[PDB]
Chains A and B, each alone.
Chain A
């Protein structure tokens, strides 16, 4: 629509003028092709005698005609009488490594044990693994993956037990590979878990428990699995989580029992593994479907979420059931901490910075990447 896009463009200018009062950091950068994936690598280099530090990302490309690439880009984050410190990003966000990828990168995640190893989801059933040290940083204008793993966007390395990878296959099943101690380029599945009745969307390992992993699907269910159990056709638990397709899930990093799930019914549902019958809380506010949800690495009571709507909400669940004014009721519930209106299109993915608190990188279908930190006075009082 020609009207709607004009109304989006004006609201971007409103947001852009408000950024000194709503943020401490904003770093917009237009990519060549739009990325469906984003994740901060855990390492950080502190260069000698500078006021910034080099953090790195794991990006992809989503293209039909031109050749797709697995991207890794550096980012300069600052260290610790005029208003509005605007400048111009130049040499802050730049591409370090480009590797040729067969088909579009729907998701890409680094291996916790060896951050050099990156698995990448494809539209097909297979998952390609890459080691960016092995490949050259300058690709010629031929894909060359280190491992091909035969079998939605789901992808998850296990933090415990190196080399164990999960993913949502195309036939309503969850594959499980074991790439540690391969004798051979191609690898086949160790286990195929067949519980869900519809398309599996996302799958995630439990953080403190080697055997536990959760999954979500279009059949409106949250299935908590156990790899040790012999019966692969039925999970340990099974909840009717939402009224629509459940697109994502994420476990809390500070509690073994707590997790969240996002769905197409415009709600993020909070859960507890000790009682899957009761739903703890349903975060309502989002204006469209939820496709991603992430907990803050630093703060246990903080989580963010994004999806089909151009806004990314940040939730502070320590404010649940606080006494608001009637003016603040119009804005939303008190557990909703911050709304990020920087993007002008569907936010495909985002990721919390593991080293610098409150810094988030988000990507979207309008070709742009935004590394940003909300204002200090919002989260602190």
Chain B
């Protein structure tokens, strides 16, 4: 088909964090076949240049039995 490489640069890494509202990683993670606005975050990241705990498995099993099927 077409082999390729991707090591994401550290400018793109924090560009996602700075432009969280435009990117929407929570939305984009489950929508791989929606084209992301690649122009908008690149404009806002350059324009706005100058500037987690997981909760254990004991808690989620306790939640699952507390809120059952």
User: Which residues of A lie under 8 Å from residue B47 when comparing CB positions?
Assistant: none
Could you mark each residue 272-306 of chain A with 1 if its beta carbon is under 8 Å from any beta carbon of chain B, else 0? Answer: 10000011111000000000000000011100000
Task: Specify the chain A residue showing the minimal Cβ separation from B31.
Answer: A331
CA separation between A179 and B27, bound complex, in Å? 50
Contact with B34, one of A12, A14, A375, A381 (Cβ below 8 angstroms):
A14
CA separation between A215 and B19, bound complex, in Å? 46
User: Which residues of A lie under 8 Å from residue B65 when comparing CB positions?
Assistant: 278, 280
Q: Determine the main DSSP class of A at the interface with B.
A: mixed
CA separation between A318 and B53, bound complex, in Å? 10
- Flag whether B56 is at the interface (Cβ < 8 A): yes
Could you mark each residue 325-360 of chain A with 1 if its beta carbon is under 8 Å from any beta carbon of chain B, else 0? Answer: 001100110001111111010000000000000000
- Please, how many residues of chain A have a CB less than 8 angstroms from a CB on the other chain? 71
How near does chain A come to B41, taking the closest CB pair, in angstroms?
8
Contact with A377, one of B7, B16, B59 (Cβ below 8 angstroms):
B16
B67 touches A84 (CB 8 A): no
Task: Specify the chain A residue showing the minimal Cβ separation from B46.
Answer: A81
How near does chain B come to A20, taking the closest CB pair, in angstroms?
5
B30 touches A255 (CB 8 A): no
Task: Specify the chain B residue showing the minimal Cβ separation from A374.
Answer: B29
How near does chain B come to A373, taking the closest CB pair, in angstroms?
9
How near does chain B come to A333, taking the closest CB pair, in angstroms?
10
CA separation between A327 and B33, bound complex, in Å? 17
A30 touches B3 (CB 8 A): yes
User: Which residues of A lie under 8 Å from residue B60 when comparing CB positions?
Assistant: 301, 317-318, 320
A258 touches B61 (CB 8 A): yes
Using known A-B contacts A278-B68, A377-B25, determine if residue A14 contacts B8 with beta carbons closer than 8 Å.
no
- Flag whether A24 is at the interface (Cβ < 8 A): yes
* Chain A residues numbered 212-262 whose CB sits less than 8 Å from any CB in chain B: 252, 254-255, 258
CA separation between A129 and B9, bound complex, in Å? 43
User: Which residues of B lie under 8 Å from residue A380 when comparing CB positions?
Assistant: 52
Task: Specify the chain A residue showing the minimal Cβ separation from B4.
Answer: A28
How near does chain B come to A166, taking the closest CB pair, in angstroms?
26
How near does chain A come to B58, taking the closest CB pair, in angstroms?
9
B55 touches A281 (CB 8 A): no
Using known A-B contacts A22-B29, A278-B68, A377-B25, determine if residue A83 contacts B12 with beta carbons closer than 8 Å.
yes
- Flag whether A88 is at the interface (Cβ < 8 A): yes
- Flag whether A82 is at the interface (Cβ < 8 A): yes
Contact with B64, one of A320, A367, A368 (Cβ below 8 angstroms):
A320
User: Which residues of B lie under 8 Å from residue A95 when comparing CB positions?
Assistant: none
Using known A-B contacts A282-B69, A338-B30, determine if residue A85 contacts B3 with beta carbons closer than 8 Å.
no
- Flag whether A160 is at the interface (Cβ < 8 A): no
CA separation between A18 and B54, bound complex, in Å? 26
Interface residues of B (CB under 8 A from A): 1-9, 11-13, 15-17, 20, 23, 25-36, 38, 41-42, 52, 54-57, 59-61, 63-65, 67-69
21 contacts between A and B (CB under 8 A): A11-B32, A14-B32, A14-B33, A21-B36, A24-B8, A30-B3, A78-B7, A85-B9, A85-B12, A89-B3, A89-B4, A92-B5, A258-B61, A270-B64, A272-B61, A280-B61, A280-B64, A317-B60, A327-B27, A338-B29, A338-B30
